[PDB]
């Protein structure tokens, strides 16, 4: 076939019932994740090729960067609750990997302030039980798939993208193969 299990994707030995349709995992400490966001724009190109009726989910993980890694998972919960993902994603990536100006929870907080989220609003969210349960959801989703590596994408809790098996000669061709694979898997 043109799309082969173990080639552009792998199948989960134990499928995850009720899982989000398109589920992506990342870390602000993860170098290919930085590429996926800034240079390749994977999430957005997947969206553009996904059918109608499909929701896309993106979660942060704890297993990179120790204590700061966990702060970042809570901060991403804050971003999701406030709906400000598209305003903090880039400065968070750059603060961690490019400028290395993010070293504490206060520095994460500065990124939200500079993006125009108000201190009051940020701290209330940070401390809210809605963010607590949002952190729980991120952890549970990752736990459900025994996740030990990022970036990662899962389709319908059954299939996991395998970018290792795609030509990286051309970044544009790579992104399209990736997106086309998500679509194929979506329709499966």
PDB file of C-alpha atoms in Angstrom, residues 24 33 46 50 53 57 74 85 89 91 94 99-100 116-117 121 125 130-131 143 154 175 186:
ATOM      1  CA  UNK A  24      -0.585  16.625  19.515  1.00  0.00           C
ATOM      2  CA  UNK A  33       8.892  20.965  18.659  1.00  0.00           C
ATOM      3  CA  UNK A  46      -2.640  19.825   9.341  1.00  0.00           C
ATOM      4  CA  UNK A  50      -8.420  18.258   7.875  1.00  0.00           C
ATOM      5  CA  UNK A  53     -16.099  18.612  11.982  1.00  0.00           C
ATOM      6  CA  UNK A  57      -5.984  19.383  20.557  1.00  0.00           C
ATOM      7  CA  UNK A  74       0.565  24.614  34.132  1.00  0.00           C
ATOM      8  CA  UNK A  85      -2.242  30.006  22.919  1.00  0.00           C
ATOM      9  CA  UNK A  89       3.547  29.999  21.984  1.00  0.00           C
ATOM     10  CA  UNK A  91       7.715  33.877  22.996  1.00  0.00           C
ATOM     11  CA  UNK A  94      12.099  31.586  22.142  1.00  0.00           C
ATOM     12  CA  UNK A  99      17.280  33.664  24.325  1.00  0.00           C
ATOM     13  CA  UNK A 100      17.253  31.516  27.462  1.00  0.00           C
ATOM     14  CA  UNK A 116      -0.984  41.701  27.210  1.00  0.00           C
ATOM     15  CA  UNK A 117      -2.633  39.255  29.597  1.00  0.00           C
ATOM     16  CA  UNK A 121      -6.065  37.582  35.299  1.00  0.00           C
ATOM     17  CA  UNK A 125      -6.052  31.476  36.246  1.00  0.00           C
ATOM     18  CA  UNK A 130     -10.192  24.940  36.176  1.00  0.00           C
ATOM     19  CA  UNK A 131      -6.464  25.133  35.357  1.00  0.00           C
ATOM     20  CA  UNK A 143      -0.368   8.699  30.359  1.00  0.00           C
ATOM     21  CA  UNK A 154      -2.111  10.710  17.664  1.00  0.00           C
ATOM     22  CA  UNK A 175       5.002  19.034   6.020  1.00  0.00           C
ATOM     23  CA  UNK A 186      -8.472  10.714   9.910  1.00  0.00           C
TER      24      UNK A 186
END
